[PDB]
Amino acid sequence: RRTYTLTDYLKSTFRVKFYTLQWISDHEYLYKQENNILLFNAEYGNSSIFLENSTFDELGYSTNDYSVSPDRQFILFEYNYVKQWRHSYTASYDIYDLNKRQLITEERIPNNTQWITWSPVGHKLAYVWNNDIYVKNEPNLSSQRITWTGKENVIYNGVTDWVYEEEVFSAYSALWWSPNGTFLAYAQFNDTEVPLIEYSFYSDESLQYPKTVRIPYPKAGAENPTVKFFVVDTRTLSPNASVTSYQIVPPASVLIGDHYLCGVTWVTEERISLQWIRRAQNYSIIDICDYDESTGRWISSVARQHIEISTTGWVGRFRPAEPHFTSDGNSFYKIISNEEGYKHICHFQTDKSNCTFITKGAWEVIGIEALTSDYLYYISNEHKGMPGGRNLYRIQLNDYTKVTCLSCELNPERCQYYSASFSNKAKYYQLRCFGPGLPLYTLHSSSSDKELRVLEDNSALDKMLQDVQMPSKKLDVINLHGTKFWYQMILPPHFDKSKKYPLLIEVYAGPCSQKVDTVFRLSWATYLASTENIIVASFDGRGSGYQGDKIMHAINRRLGTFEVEDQIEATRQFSKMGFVDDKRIAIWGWSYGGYVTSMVLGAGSGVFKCGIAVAPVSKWEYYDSVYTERYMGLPTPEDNLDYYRNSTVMSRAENFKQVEYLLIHGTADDNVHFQQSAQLSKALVDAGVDFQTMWYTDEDHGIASNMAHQHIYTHMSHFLKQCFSLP
Amino acid sequence: RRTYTLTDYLKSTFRVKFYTLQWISDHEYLYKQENNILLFNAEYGNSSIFLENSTFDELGYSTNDYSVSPDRQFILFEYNYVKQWRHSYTASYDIYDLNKRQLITEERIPNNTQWITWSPVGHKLAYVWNNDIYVKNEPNLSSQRITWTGKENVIYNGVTDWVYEEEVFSAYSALWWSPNGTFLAYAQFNDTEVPLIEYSFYSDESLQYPKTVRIPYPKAGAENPTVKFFVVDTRTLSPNASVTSYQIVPPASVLIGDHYLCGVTWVTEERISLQWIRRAQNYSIIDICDYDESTGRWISSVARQHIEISTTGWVGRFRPAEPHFTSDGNSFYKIISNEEGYKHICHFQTDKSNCTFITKGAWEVIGIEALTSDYLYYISNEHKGMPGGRNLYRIQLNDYTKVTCLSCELNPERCQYYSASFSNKAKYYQLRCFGPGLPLYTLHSSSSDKELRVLEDNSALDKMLQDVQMPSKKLDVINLHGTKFWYQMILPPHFDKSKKYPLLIEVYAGPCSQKVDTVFRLSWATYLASTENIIVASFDGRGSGYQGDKIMHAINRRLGTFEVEDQIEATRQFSKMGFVDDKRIAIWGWSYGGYVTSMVLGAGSGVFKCGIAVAPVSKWEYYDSVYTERYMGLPTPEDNLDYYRNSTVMSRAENFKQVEYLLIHGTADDNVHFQQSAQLSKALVDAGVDFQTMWYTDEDHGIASNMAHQHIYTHMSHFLKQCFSLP
């Protein structure tokens, strides 16, 4: 039998199918099948053609994305996709009238449109062009300019700046329409005082001189972008009328210093919830503002303010959890840490300070999925006490004792990791099972919890993998300093416990990380285990997520310590097992995992023979302010300079003399600048350490271009085989 | 016995001693011995202390350089050395009065002085500060501002811009005092329209954001710096007076288009020789200008103009040869190509077009060293028909048949490569022997040609090398396409002809290159041959220098062709010898040698297993205009775009699949931009080719910082040993 090869992984010969749908009502959803947009009815099972694939072929361009207006009268077509950062992109847009089956030719959406969104009702459009907001009440009508402040690299209206995109919102959008489209709320980011990150972009071979990319990027302790939040009354939008807008300022408790807007949630047409966090990120406030009909003001009240603090570390996981409001908006449900340090759902009253915990246990709620008048639906890792598992649960709002696991025992051996998507009134839901077995996509009714149908079962993939010697993924526990921690091992086929196998540690180990889960993956590790007979292990120690604040906050204000030390002690234990060759142990990782790899290799433990660090952080002062300060505080002698100073990979340069090290980085990395790797290599050169490098010209943080992706894993495979004396 | 190791090479444990002297009269010279400046008298042999080392210790700073005024009244001390490019640097200067044995405290030379020079007589000073010229008639007196146009990165007065330093002058200075210091001639370089090369400089680890270095650098075909040449009358220099200056424009034949000033030679106080070259560099003209006493003008005449044209390639070797004038200035001697294509000395009359060749033969004159009323002294490779040898010859100006070789038979086995330094009236000369044996420095009288003394014989080095198994350097000839070409081989100790040794080719192969010579070197090749038992060979084929224009101009308008092809055919012949392992042949080079190594590896010959390219050119359109256009012309479809297009390393990317390739480059390289290796790696990634890289952070073209230098050779040694299966 054949094995899962490098070619198999790189050329994606074994395809994992999925089922992406867009709920457009309480019982209907849109699905793209063979480039046709089909409208499926969950209530009866039947489907109809919403838009024929023949309309796509006549557009004159490839349709990578579509958006149907909520009233189903128009469709937005995305073409000329020009990717910027992780979520940002500029594109050209066409509006197709579904009523008259014609394409809008007059007053079109301009070229280089940064972001575009329909109103939640009707067919109003709000788009961002040249860092300014424009509103089209009708797709054939002229757009109305909302903002005049927009300036390239300086002022951003309706779109995030670099750091808000990467670390705060995890989205390029900073526009929020009110439920009935009366109001268009937006954030304004001012990057005037933010220093620029500059690096060379070489472009195509024909470009004689390289260009200098300049991005306002705040590094740890640097000047941060400022934010302003406005609510525009779209009703007064007329060509010869001024823009009616009200600026909502944060509460005094956060307004006294540097802050961030971390969340926006429309409650009703006349009530908006704003979530602000201080720059320290151990203090968060929810300010619920009400519209005054007589003045047009959005008034805040002390009674409507909800504080969330952390004394042991930071607020939330990567940000405070979002409030989930009732239809009336008089109460909300939010994930907060309890007295025991576990992240659970608390029920809050909009005008009262006290909350009531509706969930409890030595496990955590991942997210609130849906909320009806009677039920709340959520994802948690409660099942079998596995933090690497995910299941859908429903809690009765009048009786918190009545909790049902909707997904737990559907396919207990095949399915332990779930995600869910609910219909408009949470009447139906799609369940997404990601592993340990082949991913399974199913549809359910919320009333009966009956499985209506199997949307995708990956049967084509099952047939393909029968002819291949696939590796086995084993999940287990080990005890480190009296605490039980989880590990996983991708084991080679025909695994013999008497034989001694080489071991490769795959690491992330970042604050709130989870490398150990039940997700099915056709990864590079699959190839290493299947073809090269390498055990690929991962471990979640101190600082990892979804196991309580005690474990998560263990690395507070001391990144590069416990999580690094735990990777070494876990490997020492793995090597004690008689099936591991102690002479052939390697460690590798990307981003935070590249930093951990490097801090592990610089620890001088003697455990690891070699390691591969891909685009790693080398010194926390070089990384962005939002992420870094959340865990480290400020790099001032008054705050945490000392722990910033002794957590650099450079300070461990001398120990690298005992290992084989491969350092990889993309030159056009906007996130973890090439500077990080360039400063690390320099220190190793100064320490007299031999190591290997690999720069990837014009590649960003992902090193995800088709040719670069293939090259990096082929390079990493050669290095590992050299290190493990493998042909 | 011990071998010459990597540590021996890198830490320079075996020191090659030299003897540096400064002729300050026709019979006297200055020598720095144990930080004492001793004044030696060649006429009698005796020496005296000119400046005690006790004066250096009280200065308060390290004296890296000293300059005595021609009248021996003052001494200039260089401290705070801040290196810029290949020859450029900014430093702080102190003047010490040798008469009153005091230091100058008032009206001092400013900090960040770019260049400083004494007048050829007396003690006048001309210095460059903030791109402007200042003159001090007296070291205690205030300086007089000469130029007002100086602007950082834009206007350069008295100092070269990037390209004039690197490619035209091979010096930072663009100031020329007249023999008796009446006039101060200078060039002004205008870089307004020159595009900038931008690259990141990371600096010390503490620097949070990298800085962007911006240098006006003209790439092949880009807008070039403009040049203005002025002669300032220093006599009218007064604080309340304007500067008296005359701008000398090039002759009409050069002035019609883009040109360069390539040489400045003062003939008399009232006669200056300017050498101009067209941008094409196949047309040069010497314009001899005479001072008009009644008007202050520098008048040129058609009769005083001397044109040098090349139809087969470029003028001169890297620039047209400099004219060597008689004391009267009515005639001059210059190296030009003869009817046979060989560089020989031609005698010209200042007001006549015709010249008379004073030398002849199938060999070349390297340079005119000294000129008296009766004799001309020159260096040539005539001896034993070896183009890699250098000897001092003297020719009688009244009888060109009377030629004496002054150095040929001094030490015929030890000394075949010579350089010379003559006294003010060529009454005495120092002879510098560089190999094949240990370097030997000697003093000689021009009248008797008697060796007065042995300055340095490297006897300490001889004693050290006796206990070390040193490799042997063999020089020989091979026939390629009917032409005899020279090669050299560093052979391992106890060389066994039955044993098959791995072979390393060390290449330069650039236009006018000479890798094959009789110079003694304690190089990386010494270690590879001595410790690792690797034969290190070099070869000079088509395009190489000092063997006539036929061989040199062979690669005109076709770089990457013949010189690459000849490196392959020479290696094929070397491998035919039964002492070379054909399975283990490698090739390596720096700059043009890196370009050649990359072209050889991409040729798909099957001869080479591996190769190392250090800071190579990858595409000629990325390299500067002066060097590139000299051999390639312009990259326009009207000129040589087609040969620019097919001479990139990138076009040969697919063939690299058959070889092991190591690509090295410094990130802060001003000469061959990192862009070149960044564009090369990108093409190899796009071709799906595996290779190895190594970037050197903040390192420039030399990769000459103590730590980087050690790291590079240690890294290349590991790569070579891996390639040759050596422990």
Ligand SMILES: *[C@@H]1O[C@H](CO)[C@@H](O[C@@H]2O[C@H](CO)[C@@H](O)[C@H](O)[C@H]2NC(C)=O)[C@H](O)[C@H]1NC(C)=O
């Ligand atoms: C346009 O739509 C048709 C369906 O009307 C697509 O045809 C299906 O294609 C898949 C994949 O090749 C087949 O498995 C089905 O059997 C086909 N169905 C029918 C009814 O023929 C067609 O592929 C689409 N074309 C494009 C270019 O997207």
Ligand SMILES: *[C@@H]1O[C@H](CO)[C@@H](O[C@@H]2O[C@H](CO)[C@@H](O)[C@H](O)[C@H]2NC(C)=O)[C@H](O)[C@H]1NC(C)=O
């Ligand atoms: C930075 O310095 C601190 C303080 O010296 C280090 O913390 C100590 O680490 C040792 C193990 O090496 C423990 O035994 C101590 O209990 C730790 N002390 C404290 C106060 O926590 C820390 O390891 C260093 N950080 C890095 C990244 O090396």
Ligand SMILES: *[C@@H]1O[C@H](CO)[C@@H](O[C@@H]2O[C@H](CO)[C@@H](O)[C@H](O)[C@H]2NC(C)=O)[C@H](O)[C@H]1NC(C)=O
């Ligand atoms: C350096 O060169 C620039 C041209 O590149 C000269 O600038 C021009 O000067 C004339 C006359 O003053 C103006 O009409 C042009 O508009 C200028 N052009 C540009 C591009 O600036 C400049 O004078 C030169 N400087 C020196 C000191 O020689």
Ligand SMILES: *[C@@H]1O[C@H](CO)[C@@H](O[C@@H]2O[C@H](CO)[C@@H](O)[C@H](O)[C@H]2NC(C)=O)[C@H](O)[C@H]1NC(C)=O
């Ligand atoms: C660029 O293309 C020309 C195409 O003619 C190459 O020139 C030929 O080189 C081969 C070498 O084996 C000779 O046999 C031909 O006679 C040459 N032709 C001409 C017209 O000169 C040239 O070598 C290519 N350059 C590179 C760098 O590969």
Ligand SMILES: Cn1c(=O)c2c(nc(N3CCC[C@@H](N)C3)n2Cc2ccccc2Br)n(C)c1=O
């Ligand atoms: C809120 N808001 C605005 O509504 C706004 C604005 N700048 C303008 N102008 C656009 C350029 C032409 C200029 N005549 C008006 N307006 C629109 C406007 C204002 C008042 C009365 C009628 C109108 Br129409 N700025 C800067 C702003 O902040």
Ligand SMILES: Cn1c(=O)c2c(nc(N3CCC[C@@H](N)C3)n2Cc2ccccc2Br)n(C)c1=O
């Ligand atoms: C390995 N690895 C990561 O290192 C990792 C990650 N998610 C995050 N973060 C949360 C989202 C915003 C992101 N800036 C931080 N990180 C950390 C990180 C990412 C990229 C660059 C530097 C760092 Br430090 N995931 C999912 C993962 O797999």
Ligand SMILES: Cn1c(=O)c2c(nc(N3CCC[C@@H](N)C3)n2Cc2ccccc2Br)n(C)c1=O
């Ligand atoms: C040659 N040459 C100059 O000599 C020169 C100059 N600009 C100045 N000055 C600078 C500031 C003082 C002002 N008098 C003009 N000068 C000096 C000067 C001029 C005329 C009369 C007396 C003097 Br003192 N330029 C531009 C130039 O080219």
Ligand SMILES: Cn1c(=O)c2c(nc(N3CCC[C@@H](N)C3)n2Cc2ccccc2Br)n(C)c1=O
């Ligand atoms: C290997 N090797 C060289 O490649 C070499 C060289 N001398 C020269 N030149 C003459 C001086 C000006 C210089 N720009 C060209 N070069 C070519 C070159 C140098 C640096 C960057 C790119 C190139 Br193309 N020597 C002495 C040597 O040894």
Ligand SMILES: *[C@@H]1O[C@H](CO)[C@@H](O)[C@H](O)[C@H]1NC(C)=O
């Ligand atoms: C499904 O069938 C019902 C039958 O009553 C019909 O009303 C509905 O429109 C159909 N849906 C689709 C998507 O065709």
Ligand SMILES: *[C@@H]1O[C@H](CO)[C@@H](O)[C@H](O)[C@H]1NC(C)=O
């Ligand atoms: C952006 O901030 C600067 C201060 O850093 C301020 O002067 C400017 O007016 C601000 N612009 C806007 C549109 O808020």
Ligand SMILES: *[C@@H]1O[C@H](CO)[C@@H](O)[C@H](O)[C@H]1NC(C)=O
């Ligand atoms: C708006 O003003 C323009 C002139 O500036 C005028 O042409 C147009 O008719 C006005 N629109 C309305 C709705 O009155």
Ligand SMILES: *[C@@H]1O[C@H](CO)[C@@H](O)[C@H](O)[C@H]1NC(C)=O
């Ligand atoms: C939040 O962090 C700051 C800075 O470390 C600290 O002074 C403050 O007391 C912290 N607040 C809480 C609630 O822990």
Ligand SMILES: *[C@@H]1O[C@H](CO)[C@@H](O)[C@H](O)[C@H]1NC(C)=O
């Ligand atoms: C200074 O010169 C004396 C000889 O006059 C010598 O003995 C001494 O070593 C020298 N010192 C230094 C620091 O060069």
Ligand SMILES: *[C@@H]1O[C@H](CO)[C@@H](O)[C@H](O)[C@H]1NC(C)=O
């Ligand atoms: C060398 O000796 C001669 C003897 O006549 C003397 O005049 C001269 O000054 C001496 N030179 C030096 C440099 O000591």
Ligand SMILES: *[C@@H]1O[C@H](CO)[C@@H](O)[C@H](O)[C@H]1NC(C)=O
């Ligand atoms: C030069 O001019 C200054 C005034 O600008 C004056 O003080 C000085 O005396 C003048 N020098 C001469 C030599 O006249």
Ligand SMILES: *[C@@H]1O[C@H](CO)[C@@H](O)[C@H](O)[C@H]1NC(C)=O
């Ligand atoms: C000099 O070079 C240019 C450009 O390559 C060319 O057009 C011209 O004919 C050449 N002239 C001579 C004399 O070779």
